């Protein structure tokens, strides 16, 4: 009974190390893998979350890239919260600060995520407005206590989380908003903040708040990297950077048109967004990269690892046009279930029609 | 023609109010208000951050009773969450609430036990309508930049000099929201609060709200010692407290600043002018014959002439101001000496360390 106990304990540590190692694989940065390892030792599921301003069409980093990450976590003992940050978009002047339009876009985001090929068993969609107003004393008390703990300058270091900067006129809303986002982490009892690296400053503020308050339960920051825009030098795909985005409602022709003229330098993967889509979206989705091409250009070839793919790209074995053509085809295939849903479901088709009539305000 | 009477009345009302007030942001709006066949809503707000000083009881009572007697409601906003946000009473909301309770006991025994006065708790009222309240706070924050809002630091007793926490941006957004949340017609606070009252009127113009609050600011009662332009818990030994005993009052007044011939920033004279003379409609100065003998003052003009000309020595003014303050505090003393439950409450809050 000492050797089966030993074999019971060994098998558990190997499981955790493998669970940790590929939870880390979706990530650009983890603020303490050792703390993540610790948290995966709990019997319970770990609460993870990301949050979204409903501010316009959804681009493929928020749908396609997101679902890969969420699927990895929910198949590894996590629960995942999508926080529909409607009050936040309103505070940040989005959708002309019209909350009815914001909530329409939020419903649209949920329709997208539900047809994204995410396993939904351990996924929840929570609306900021609804949840804050279920427990408004607890929530605003937290907001106020966070505001007392940090000075203004420190909080202005979080402007990037709302797409703002010191350069513009800074409204007091830009102090309230990061206090609220920080409060959300505690309000939602999050174990893992799982947002893009542009949100990291307010996730670090939350850890700092823990030290200030002598809270030992600190959230782990599991940041994912920025999916780049189509054009050279666009580090971040977004509605804000013109011509940078493929959207979740783009048609098969739109995707083909956008990929064709995207930046894809020969022999180079640094700052190459076509390669980035291959590496961050297609390869995790398919677990191989199957490069299809004409016999004239070398026929088809399957890449079973990312190193294989990189090697053949930098040495000119893969021409840019072959890389672009396959990336377009795989993005189109990954968007097929979303397209089907908005063609076959007339309520959802309606809703997409309504939200596309809106004006994208900043 | 009976609106003739209506207009004569209101004009008299307005003249009295402006005299006691230090500044009124638009008499003409206040006149329009006073000519609404409804009850106007007035308010003042207090952080429960320590013992109450005489500006907040004895002086407060004079303007409150003038407004309520004309049909107004006067809300005393017990700003418990604001005190916690402003780091008072060690941020112990339980102590803040006990202080708030003791405030109500003081106010009820110094002239505010009345139908037209409401004692409302900030925490309680915000949590009845939290979506409405916080939506306002957020929309106010969107409307003003950080520099504009830091111009309100004085309303919390803070300055640009010290470390400015984000709580000092949130607090004025919340105090501004209160004005609309409480449907206030007249903000009747000290002049140290005027920056955020002006922000509320600016918010109305930004939002095209035509119902704008009148700001009716009262002047600051000076502290006991030289150059303390404002009595406060903040300056130690600046304050006479509503719970001070007769020996405490006598001790503090004897020690106080009272420059001969000088009325400017002379706190002893300020207490005579702003509290005693309005409360009694006269000032009876008791003195020995060799020092000028007893004299009854029926106007502030004569009191000022006699003081500036050296007819009233500072010791005589002090002895009489102390007598009168003790007289005015007698109903408070009797309440806390007899109402054993108020007695126990005073004994507890006296034991609280005042924090900033
Ligand atoms: N190009 C890209 N590549 C990869 N990830 C991306 C890219 N663009 C955006 N994201 C990620 O999408 C999510 C939404 O983005 P956004 O709506 O801007 O978030 C905000 O405003 C946040 N303050 C919203 C918010 C509010 C409260 C709260 O408690 C949590 C969050 C974030 O995780 C972004 O990092
Ligand atoms: N020496 C003095 N002479 C004459 N009046 C004085 C003197 N000292 C203080 N007051 C006056 O007493 C009252 C309380 O004072 P405080 O508790 O400091 O107020 C604050 O902090 C206010 N932000 C509290 C507040 C919060 C929310 C809101 O919706 C309204 C108000 C104010 O009206 C002061 O002007
Ligand atoms: Cl409400
Ligand atoms: Mg082929
Ligand atoms: Mg009453
Ligand atoms: Mg005599």
Author numbering:
A (entry chain B): 12 to 373
B (entry chain A): 18 to 373
Source paper text:
Like E1 enzymes, aminoacyl tRNA synthetases (aaRSs) are adenylate-forming enzymes (AFEs). They catalyze the transformation of amino acids into AMP conjugates, and then into aminoacyl-tRNAs, to supply protein synthesis. PfYRS is a Class I aaRS, characterized by a catalytic domain that adopts a Rossmann fold (residues 18–260) linked to a C-terminal domain (residues 261–370) that is involved in recognition of the anticodon stem of tRNATyr. PfYRS contains the two motifs characteristic of the catalytic domain of Class I (sub-class c) tRNA synthetases: “HIGH” and “KMSKS” (70HIAQ73 and 247KMSKS251 in PfYRS).
Whereas formation of the AMP adenylate requires only Tyr and ATP, the thermal stabilization induced by ML901 required all three substrates (Tyr, ATP and tRNATyr).
